[PDB]
């Protein structure tokens, strides 16, 4: 229904991630924590670092419990090593509960904490299967549901501003909402459409068709989910498997062919700029991803605009952007590019993910993001990849 205490509890932007305030320990130590549906550990800075202005001080918490076990995470979007323990954890703009949760106290890191970023830790919201060191380390959300009456569901509304936010603006701006234990109807318009969670590890889904401005990419649907397709609030871009990325970029270039962009732009390395207010949104195509429905032989589509896949960056008074669609060798990743267009419901209790048009998506007077259905789609289980 309505969860006013949790609405507008996030801050951040797609390039730096979105974070929520949490407290750890007794007395409570406040930290800003990245909301990550692409991992399953709760890990916090626990030692001084040049890019952290605060960290978890275990010696100052009366409720700290040492698990006497280390944890190592290899190079991904950095690397880190830490020490496992448990403590009492709360979310100030969250459910009014305190839970005893596992915490990885980060003692050493390399390219993990980012200069200029405001988060001090990560809240991995995915399942125990991908937790480190192994699946015996209960993730935060599993603890929260086990210890309280909070329903086994959360929903995310990530809000892209549509323009660059400077150092002060990004700290003062509302970046979105994380509703723990429910769905807030103020955060979306139209209907919610659900896709099954294929398997509980990452939030894995199945894409059954892809269109660029209504034109079918016409690839074998297994290519779209090779080797998996996931929903990840901790990835900035929409990432596509190599072969799919190559086909999609060719189609996006063809649709936008009235303007030529350098190779560096399509590689996501180089910004493109236009005179203030003159970004030619209309030359760029909409992108639709069709997802398996909950009903046999039924699918639905989510449609995003260039206002989602062109990420605003500062250069001048020009309006500049980076192309936020990129190649992957680990499957499709529906990152902040996708999520900024939609209110996303992680319905763990019913093993499904819901999408609805976000009340904060950026658009223009001529086009809007969309969530539509149903469509008749056959042999959708064949779109899933095995081995
Ligand atoms: C903490 O513990 C564990 N974290 C992980 N993760 C895997 C990483 C990764 O490659 N992705 C795709 C991901 N979704 N999350 C991780 C990170 C995201 C960011 C980050 C930085 C800047 C912007 C954004 C955005 N949007 C995200 C830094 S690390 C953490 N894996 C296993 C663990 F035990």
Distance CA 302, CA 375 (A): 12
Contact 294, 352 (CB under 8 A): yes
Joined tokens for residue 297: 């032989």
For 203, phi then psi, to 5°, come to -85, 85
**Residue 323 and residue 265 in contact, taking contact as beta carbons nearer than 8 Å:** yes
* Residue whose tokens read 């639709």: 288
Long-range contacts made by residues 265-272, C-beta under 8 angstroms, separation at least 24? 265/322, 265/323, 266/323, 267/323, 267/326, 268/237, 268/322, 268/323, 268/324, 268/325, 268/326, 269/322, 270/322, 271/313, 271/315, 271/320, 271/321, 271/322, 272/320, 272/321, 272/322, 272/323
Which residue's CA is the closest to the ligand 1 atom numbered 30?
Answer: 39
Pairing label, strands 298-304, 287-292: antiparallel
Architecture of domain 18-150: Beta Barrel (2.40)
Cβ atoms of 9 and 21 within 8 Å: the answer is yes
Instruction: List all residues 6 or more positions away from 132 whose beta carbon is below 8 Å from its beta carbon.
Output: 40, 41, 71, 72, 73, 104
Q: Which class for 226: exposed (0-12), middle (13-18), buried (19 or more C-beta within 10 A)?
A: buried
Is residue 51 a contact partner of residue 139, using CB atoms and an 8 Å limit? no
135 among known catalytic residues: no
Helix/strand/coil for 262:
coil
Distance of CA 84 to the CA centre of its chain: 25
Catalytic pick from 36, 87, 319, 347? 36
Cβ atoms of 321 and 164 within 8 Å: the answer is no
The one-character DSSP state at 285 is: P
What CA–CA distance (Å, rounded) separates 158 from 7? 11
DSSP sequence for 293-315: -SSTTEEEEEEE-HHHHEEEE--
Q: How far apart are CA 94 and CA 165, in angstroms?
A: 25
Cα Rg for the chain, rounded, in angstroms? 21
DSSP assigned state of 329: S
What torsion, rounded to 10 degrees, do the Cα atoms 272, 238, 240, 34 define?
Answer: 120
Q: Are 321 and 271 in contact (CB under 8 A)?
A: yes
By what method was this entry solved?
Answer: X-ray
Measured in Å, how far apart are the chain's first and last C-alpha atoms?
41
Locate all alpha helices (DSSP H) within 148-208, ordered by sequence.
167-172
Phi, psi of 15, rounded to the nearest 5 degrees: -65, -25
Whole-number Cα distances in Å, 210 to 148, 202, 378:
41, 22, 15
Contact 21, 92 (CB under 8 A): yes
Listing DSSP states for 88-105 in one string gives EEE-TTS-S--EEEEEEE
Burial label for 220, CB within 10 Å (0-12, 13-18, 19+), is exposed
Return residue ranges of the chain for CATH 2.40.70.10.
18-150, 151-387
50: left (phi > 0), else alpha (psi -120 to 50), else beta?
Answer: alpha
User: Of residues 87, 142, 184, 232, which has the active-site annotation?
Assistant: 232
CB atoms within 10 A of CB 277: 8
Tell me 29's DSSP state: E
Question: What number does the ligand 1 atom closest to the CA of 121 have?
Answer: 1
Resolution (A): 1.6
Nearest atom (ligand 1) to Cα of 236: 26
**Pocket lining: 16 vs ligand 1, CB cutoff 6 Å:** yes
Token reading at 103:
């915490």
- With 0-12 CB in 10 A as exposed, 13-18 as middle and 19+ as buried, what is 307? buried
Which fold is adopted by the domain 151-387? Cathepsin D, subunit A; domain 1 (2.40.70)
- Asked if residues 174 and 359 have their Cβ atoms less than 8 Å apart, the reply is no
Cα separation, 146 vs 42, in Å, equals 16
- DSSP SS3 for 244: helix
Is there an atom of ligand 1 within 6 Å of 43 CB?
yes
Quick check: CB of 39 below 6 Å from ligand 1? yes
Q: Nearest Cα to 255, choosing from 225, 222, 288, 223? A: 288
268: left (phi over 0), alpha (psi -120 to 50) or beta: left
């Amino acid at each position: 229904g309505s969860f006013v205490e949790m609405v507008d509890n996030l801050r951040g932007k797609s390039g730096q991630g979105y974070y929520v305030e949490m407290t750890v320990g007794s007395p409570p130590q406040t930290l800003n924590i990245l909301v990550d549906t692409g991992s399953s550990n709760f890990a916090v800075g626990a030692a001084p670092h040049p890019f952290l202005h605060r960290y978890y001080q275990r010696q100052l918490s009366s409720t700290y419990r040492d698990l006497r076990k280390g944890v190592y995470v290899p190079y991904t979007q950095g690397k880190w090593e830490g020490e496992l323990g448990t403590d009492l954890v709360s979310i100030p703009h969250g459910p009014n509960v305190t839970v005893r949760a596992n915490i990885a106290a980060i003692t050493e890191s390399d390219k993990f904490f980012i200069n200029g970023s405001n988060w001090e830790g990560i809240l991995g919201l995915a399942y125990a299967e991908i937790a480190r060191p192994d699946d015996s380390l209960e993730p935060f959300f599993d603890s929260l549901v086990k210890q309280t009456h909070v329903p086994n569901l959360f929903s995310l509304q990530l809000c892209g501003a549509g323009f660059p936010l400077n150092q002060s603006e990004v700290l003062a701006s509302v970046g979105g909402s994380m509703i723990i234990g429910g769905i807030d109807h103020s955060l979306y318009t139209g209907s919610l459409w659900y896709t099954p969670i294929r398997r509980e590890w990452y939030y894995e889904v199945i894409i059954v068709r892809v269109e660029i401005n209504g034109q079918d990419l016409k690839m074998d649907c297994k290519e779209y989910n090779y080797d998996k397709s996931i929903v990840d609030s901790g990835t900035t871009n929409l990432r596509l498997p190599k072969k799919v990325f190559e086909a999609a970029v060719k189609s996006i270039k063809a649709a936008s062919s009235t303007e030529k962009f350098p190779d560096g732009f399509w590689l996501g390395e180089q910004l493109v700029c236009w005179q203030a207010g003159t970004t030619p949104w209309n030359i760029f195509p909409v992108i639709s991803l069709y997802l398996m429905g909950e009903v046999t032989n039924q699918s639905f589509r989510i449609t995003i605009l260039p206002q989602q896949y062109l990420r605003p960056v500062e250069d001048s008074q020009d309006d500049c952007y980076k192309f936020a669609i990129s190649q992957s060798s680990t499957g499709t990743v529906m990152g902040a590019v996708i999520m900024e267009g939609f209110y996303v419901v992680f319905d763990r209790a019913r093993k499904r993910i819901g999408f609805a048009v976000s009340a904060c998506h950026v658009h223009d007077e001529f086009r809007t993001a969309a969530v539509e259905g149903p469509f008749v789609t056959l042999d959708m289980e064949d779109c899933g990849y095995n081995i």
